[PDB]
Design a protein around this ligand. Structure first.
Ligand SMILES: Nc1ccc2cc3ccc(N)cc3nc2c1
Ligand SMILES: [Mg+2]
Ligand SMILES: [Mg+2]
Ligand SMILES: [Mg+2]
Lengths: 215, 225
RNA sequence: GGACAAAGAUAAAAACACAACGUAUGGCGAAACACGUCAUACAGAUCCGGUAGGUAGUCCGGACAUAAACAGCGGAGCGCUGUUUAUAAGUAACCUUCCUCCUUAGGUCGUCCAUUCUUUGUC
């Protein structure tokens, strides 16, 4: 039977100087054969802790590791701006090796309302034979937001794809784009298209809409 | 001084074979365990395979058992991962890692490569079709409007987007590409500009897709009335 | 006094040779497994009877314990249970008694200790 490593929490929000703890629970004994790593987006992981308590050469002291039974914790005594990354735990007691699902450490910030814009399909795209309508939610925090597309005030499901940016270096906010892809004919069968955003910063749903064939 | 460089990734069709290499420098692979770990785009690390020192013992994960072979060539100081009968789920960045000395670093992986991308897909290289996202015809909210381009139906990655030939770099968000049901990628790049400039200033996005040899400059302007 | 006899108490006591693979755990070797090396442990010298009175780590016989092979049971592999076999060569070799034409053998009888003192019966 393979060993499972369950990492909690999947995502954590904290500020510079915070003490952070991430835990990993093993389905069976793994003794002390546990390691932790830090992967910054687009970069290879870097070894942080080995043998589940030992600090790897050259790693900052603030990072520590503790073992209680089959539970292992990684602790940063005081966060620094360079310490915001995804963190992984790994067991190496028995093959096959297994990794934790990861924990992303993000900057904590003021609740920020999204600025919402709606872009109608371009004429070149309708000449190409497809229609895409793009909603943009700009500079908002936290990353938890919802977009409800409405064609002629009719809710649409399964035709919308979303994409979110990594937290900004300066504003520490996330931006989201939602794209609704409809057939050119279907885009030409409906007169009203709206984007409804429900976010914590938004006291009420904020909707930005256009009509088919209007300026 | 210690370095690992993976190579040999790329795009392969489902059911096809690929062979990854991990060239080492600053150490001899015979005295260490070598591991291959893959990371699917937007997903976590997944251990793939390992080779032990002085025995050649090979260990694999269930997801790859029977289809992957890990080997080592000491004279070329290089590890290898042979993948046969590949499928879309194998698409990932593959790192090779050195396992550290047990006395110094336990069983942790102390050095990794930059990774190499493996894309399993039947899609053919397509040049991106860049469309224009017009700034709001109505007055913008906040006094700054948003104008963007849509780089849609391009394979494979990556694309590069500049604005005004790179003169406009502040406030631009290029979104991560999303794979659509077609198997082709799509993304959008948007910029916020002062609304006073929308009629006075012309905004162009420059999209480059080197794999297809595609350079496009698309002008985004407000629409009629 | 001495002799024979029985019954007691006491003491004694087996030659030569006794091997060689390997397994497990842990440490170390640039070392999760394999490999090499070192340390430690295991690798029937348990119990009983007999062997014309006695002496067995090695006999003969049996039991038990432990290991291997085979059979059965439960959820190919894995774990147990039951049976068989094994646990040196060797009670081989030499010497020796008897028997058998397995006779250039096979079996079998021996190889060691049995001292000292006490009581009684009859000469
Ligand atoms: N070599 C031998 C031969 C026969 C033996 C017979 C014995 C009978 C009883 C005992 N206690 C020890 C014995 N030892 C013997 C040693
Ligand atoms: Mg006896
Ligand atoms: Mg003796
Ligand atoms: Mg015998």
């Amino acid at each position: 039977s393979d060993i499972q490593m369950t990492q909690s929490p999947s995502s954590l929000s904290a500020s510079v100087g915070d003490r952070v703890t991430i835990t990993c629970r093993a389905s069976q004994s793994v003794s002390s054969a546990v390691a932790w790593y830090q992967q910054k987006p687009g970069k290879a992981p870097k070894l942080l802790i080995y043998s589940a308590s030992s600090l790897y050469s050259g790693v900052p002291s603030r990072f520590s590791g503790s073992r209680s039974g089959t539970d292992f914790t990684l602790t940063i005594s005081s966060l620094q701006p360079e310490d915001f990354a995804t963190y992984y735990c790994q067991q190496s007691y028995s093959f096959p090796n297994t990794f934790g699902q990861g924990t992303k450490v993000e900057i904590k910030r003021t609740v920020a309302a999204p600025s919402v814009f709606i872009f109608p399909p371009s004429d070149e795209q309708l000449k190409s034979g497809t229609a895409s309508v793009v909603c943009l939610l700009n500079n908002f925090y936290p990353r938890e937001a919802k977009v409800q597309w409405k064609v002629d005030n009719a809710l649409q499901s399964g035709n919308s794809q979303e994409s979110v940016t990594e937290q900004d270096s300066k504003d520490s906010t996330y931006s989201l784009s939602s794209t609704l892809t409809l057939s050119k004919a279907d885009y030409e069968k409906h007169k009203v298209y709206a984007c409804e955003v429900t976010h914590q910063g938004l006291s009420s749903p904020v909707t930005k809409s256009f009509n088919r064939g209007e300026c | 001084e210690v370095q690992l460089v993976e190579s040999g990734g790329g795009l392969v069709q489902p059911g096809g074979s690929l062979r990854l290499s991990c060239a080492a420098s600053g150490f001899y692979i015979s005295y260490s365990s070598i591991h291959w770990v893959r990371q699917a785009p937007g997903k976590g690390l997944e251990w793939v395979a390992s080779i032990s020192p002085y025995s050649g013992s090979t260990y694999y994960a269930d997801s790859v058992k029977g289809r992957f072979t890990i080997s080592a060539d000491t004279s070329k100081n290089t590890a290898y991962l042979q993948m046969n009968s590949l499928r879309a789920e194998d698409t990932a960045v593959y790192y090779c890692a050195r396992q550290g000395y047990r006395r110094r670093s336990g069983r942790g992986f102390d050095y990794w490569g930059q990774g190499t991308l493996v894309t399993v897909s039947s899609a053919s290289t397509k040049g991106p079709s860049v469309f224009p996202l017009a700034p709001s015809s109505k007055s913008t909210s906040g006094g700054t409007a948003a104008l963007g381009c849509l780089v849609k139906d391009y394979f494979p990655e990556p694309v590069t987007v500049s604005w005004n030939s790179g003169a406009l770099t502040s406030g631009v968000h290029t979104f991560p590409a999303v794979l659509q049901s077609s198997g082709l990628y799509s993304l959008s790049s948007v910029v916020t500009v002062p609304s006073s400039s929308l009629g006075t200033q012309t905004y162009i996005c420059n999209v480059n897709h080197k794999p297809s040899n595609t350079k496009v400059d698309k002008k985004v302007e407000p629409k009629s009335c």
